[PDB]
Design a binder for this molecule. Structure first.
Ligand code: RB6
Ligand code: CL
Ligand code: CL
Length: 502
């Protein structure tokens, strides 16, 4: 006949911003039209104008209402403007109503879709930060008591039991200016190199903050139809790959920390191959005999780093890689985030000792690799990762000794600046440092560059990953390295970092 009933008051979901307060996810009022079938069933002569106004075929609309003739609630159409959502109301159809609802809009769209993620039709976090921080963002719905007549129509608002509480604002670590730059340059790089996909991560080496995180391909989170699963992947956190030669600076850190190696020491890598039983370690360039430790990194000699690894033992190398976080949980709690795999042994065999040292048979994410380089850049101290703005920086862990870290930094500056080095990674006006990698996938390759700058007082670490570029010959520092140069140049300028190569 008629009942007093309690119902929800929806909460205003919290604003997501970038680190400087630029809006990334905003709850915006949209007009929704709904209907009460029991009321509609008393006004059937109105149905065709209501259908016509909603762009619906008259018969299909009529069937829908007849089938739901004992329900008290259906949506007619959601996400209209006030002008549209009153245009139907002007018809004054019995049992037809408008409400303002909150739904998400993403002002930067595709540029930060992977990091931010999205909400569903019910305004609850479904992907990315929206999911990860849903409790923070959602707030608590209110509650009102309401008298409903025989048909379910609200005739009295009797009393509000609980007020709604809005969600909390969340400021990300991301700097939208760096994010745009990274987004544009990664996109342009895929085109110029004919690549399938890629990732770019920028980190603050002093604070642990992820300043940028972009992938190709990407998607518009405001227009999610025809949406591919591949386009939605935040590849920087949920794809694993073999890091290859980009781990060599960690092998070198172990070497310098052992007491047995200095940069000017020599290793004989002739004839560019080395047999270990059935396996054969093979260098990309095979016209070398004696190389010093910097030369091994410049030439990216797998044989050279393998011989160092035999001398110092795999255990020291594993420990450096473990401590810098390769194949280890980041603690960010991003949905689908992968940990990868740094294999361990009780007793390391010779073949596995070599392959560990040049990053073969290891599995990492782009965020892990960036974090490892941030530790190296931050004079050997690892600051915990953050996807949110860090005002009070947590204590870091000293993972490589400061002197060893500084020596390796110097060697990586030479990798970029010295004769025969990765000259295209050079950043105009600054000294930069880094290491190239090329990884077989099983004809099909990943091109990698990881580095930091300014070399003499590091501020920013960066990883560029380009998945399957279309170059026949040697990548030769011309695929991922120029992307590092362009994005690092822009990032240092936007953060007002003083040039150190005047
Ligand atoms: C480190 O990255 C080294 N690369 C490897 O040995 C890998 N395959 O080549 C590899 N490691 S793990 C894994 N799954 N694969 C050395 N570094 C580089 C470099 O400095 O870029 C290499 C160069 C290189 C190999 C293949 N190259 C072209 C690809 C397209 N056609 C040839 C290329 O430039 C290899 S040794
Ligand atoms: Cl050769
Ligand atoms: Cl390259």
């Amino acid at each position: 006949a008629r009942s007093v009933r309690h119902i929800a008051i929806p909460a205003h979901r919290g604003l997501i911003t970038d680190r400087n307060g630029e809006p990334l996810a905003v709850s915006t009022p949209v007009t929704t039209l709904w209907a009460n079938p029991k009321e509609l069933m008393t006004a059937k002569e109105r149905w065709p104008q209501l259908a016509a106004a909603l762009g619906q075929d008259t018969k299909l609309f009529a069937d829908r209402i007849e089938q739901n003739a004992e329900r008290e609630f259906i949506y007619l159409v959601r996400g209209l403007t006030p002008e549209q959502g009153e245009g139907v109301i002007a018809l004054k159809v019995p049992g037809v109503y408008s409400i303002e609802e909150f739904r998400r809009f993403y002002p930067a769209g595709e540029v930060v879709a992977h990091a931010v993620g999205f909400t569903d039709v019910d305004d609850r976090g479904r992907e990315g930060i929206e999911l990860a921080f849903d409790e923070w963002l959602a707030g608590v719905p209110g509650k009102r008591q309401v008298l409903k007549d025989r048909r379910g129509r609200v005739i009295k608002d009797v009393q509000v039991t609980k007020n709604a509480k809005p969600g909390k604002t969340l400021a990300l670590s991301i700097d939208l200016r760096l994010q745009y730059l990274a987004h544009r340059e990664l996109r342009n790089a895929l085109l110029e190199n004919g690549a399938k996909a890629g990732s770019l991560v920028i980190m603050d080496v002093k604070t642990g903050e992820i300043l940028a995180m972009t992938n190709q391909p990407t998607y518009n989170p405001n227009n999610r139809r025809n949406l591919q699963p591949a386009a939605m992947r935040n590849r920087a956190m949920i794809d694993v790959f073999e890091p290859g030669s980009t781990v060599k600076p960690f092998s070198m850190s172990a070497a310098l920390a052992s007491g047995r190696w200095k940069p000017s020491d020599i290793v004989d890598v002739y004839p560019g191959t080395l047999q270990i039983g059935r396996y054969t370690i093979r260098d990309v360039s095979r016209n070398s005999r004696q190389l010093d430790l910097t030369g091994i990194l410049i030439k990216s000699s797998n044989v050279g780093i393998s011989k160092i690894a035999f001398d110092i033992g795999a255990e020291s190398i594993y420990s450096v890689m473990q401590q810098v976080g390769l194949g280890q949980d980041t603690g960010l709690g991003f949905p689908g985030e992968r940990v990868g795999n740094l294999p361990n042994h009780r007793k390391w065999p010779k073949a596995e000792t070599a392959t560990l040292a040049y990053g073969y048979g290891l599995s990492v994410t782009a965020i892990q690799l960036a974090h490892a380089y941030a530790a190296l850049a931050n004079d050997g101290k690892s600051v915990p990762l953050s996807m949110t703005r860090v005002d009070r920086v947590p204590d870091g862990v000293q993972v490589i000794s400061p002197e060893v870290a500084s020596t390796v930094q110097g060697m990586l500056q030479q990798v970029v600046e010295a004769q025969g080095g990765v000259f295209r990674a050079q950043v105009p006006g600054y000294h930069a440092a880094g290491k190239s990698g090329t990884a077989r996938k099983v004809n099909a390759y990943r091109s990698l560059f990881a580095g930091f700058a300014p070399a003499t007082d590091p501020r920013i670490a960066m990883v560029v990953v380009i998945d399957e570029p279309s170059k026949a010959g040697y990548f030769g520092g011309l695929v991922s390295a120029p992307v590092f140069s362009k994005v690092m140049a822009g990032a240092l300028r936007l953060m007002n970092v003083p040039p150190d190569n005047l």
